[PDB]
């Protein structure tokens, strides 16, 4: 199933290792200004 990469600094610029970090986000039922009553706010 698996295979390595071949990395040396003898590689060209297209064959250079990237340390890709991916940030993924969401929004859920999961999560101070004084309350104003009867004011458009």
């Amino acid at each position, epitope marked *: *199933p*698996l*295979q*390595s990469y071949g990395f040396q600094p003898t590689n060209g610029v297209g064959y250079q290792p990237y340390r890709v970090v991916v940030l993924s986000f969401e929004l859920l039922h999961a999560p101070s200004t004084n309350l104003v009553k009867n004011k458009c706010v």
Partner: antibody
Amino acid sequence: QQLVESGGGVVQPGRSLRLSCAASGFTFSSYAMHWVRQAPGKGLEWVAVISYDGSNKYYADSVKGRFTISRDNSKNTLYLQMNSLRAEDTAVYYCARHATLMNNKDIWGQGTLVTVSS
Amino acid sequence: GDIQLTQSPSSLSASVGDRVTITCRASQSISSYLNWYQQKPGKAPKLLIYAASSLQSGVPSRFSGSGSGTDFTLTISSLQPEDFATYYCQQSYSTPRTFGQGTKVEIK
């Protein structure tokens, strides 16, 4: 990176001798592993596989002596017990790996002598 | 039955700068699943070619593999004084695996 073997020695025929071979550098776990035989002046003869990624054990029917093979994966080590001995098996053994068109992982142990004689 | 290998010649005493063709023939049609090894007698078998047509790290193109089916070829070129040792071919097509009987390239 490196393979170490259990100690070889002179054993009487018909007996049993467990063979230990521990890995280093990268694990046994993700790969398979093999055993081969070299008698002095004779070619390298394959013996048996191990396949940890499922579980299966294949033996050579040329030397079909129920030489049993299993693991100690958490020590990166492998155990094949020398069962039903006979003197022509007196040779050196190697821990082996085959580059099956995908990998380049062929790493070989140092070699220890099993001797079958009274 | 088993798959028979045919390594020819089983030895060849050679000289400096040669181009030796160590042939490993097969009893069946094996796709490319054949390898090559360096063994000075007492060493570990250092892999030379994988899948019968691909070089290896540390080993330059003085060794060169080709062939498929039944016919497999070890193309040693510009034969070096360190290359004189006992070599081997290798199937990985089926189970059981067998290896060739070896070819000792040695100084004439």
